[PDB]
Amino acid sequence: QLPADTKDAKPLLKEMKRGKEFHVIFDCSHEMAAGILKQALAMGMMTEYYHYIFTTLDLFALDVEPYRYSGVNMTGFRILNTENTQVSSIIEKWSMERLQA
Amino acid sequence: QLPADTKDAKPLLKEMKRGKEFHVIFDCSHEMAAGILKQALAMGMMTEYYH
DSSP: OOOSSGGGHHHHHHHHHHHTOOOOOOOSOHHHHHHHHHHHHHTTOOSTTOEEEOOSTTGGGSOOGGGTTTOOEEEOOOOSOTTSHHHHHHHHHHHHHHTTO | OOOSSSGGGHHHHHHHHHHTOOOOOOOSOHHHHHHHHHHHHHTTOOSSSOO
C-alpha cells in the first residue's frame, strides 16, 4: 500500500527494489502517478528490467519525456478516442477554452 | 569523443549502453560533467551497475 503522503514513497520503493519485484500494477489517479514516477526515477529504477502497468485511464496526459529514452515499458489504458477526426477537433476546441484555468 | 555540444551526448551513451561498457573515466570541466550526467540519468544509464 502507498502510505498516506505521496513523498513518503521512498521506503516502499526501496523495499520493492530490494525484493526484486520486476513487475508492478498501479491503481491511482494519475496525479499520484506523477509522484510515484518521479520517485521511481530518482531511486534509480527506470531500467528495461522493470515494466509497469497502469490502470489509471489517463496515461496519455502525463509528461512521458524525461523517462522515454530509459527503456522501461509503461503499458497503460486510454479510452478517449484520439483516433477519430471529429473527436480530436472537439478535443482541440475544448482545449482552446480549457486553458483559462 | 564527446561531440561539439553536450546535449549531443545521446548517441554515444547509446553505444556505451549497447556494448555494455560497465565502467568509465571522464574528463571535462565539470560544467560538462553536469550535462553529461543528466543525460546519463534520463538514458537509464545510472544504476548500481555502473561506476
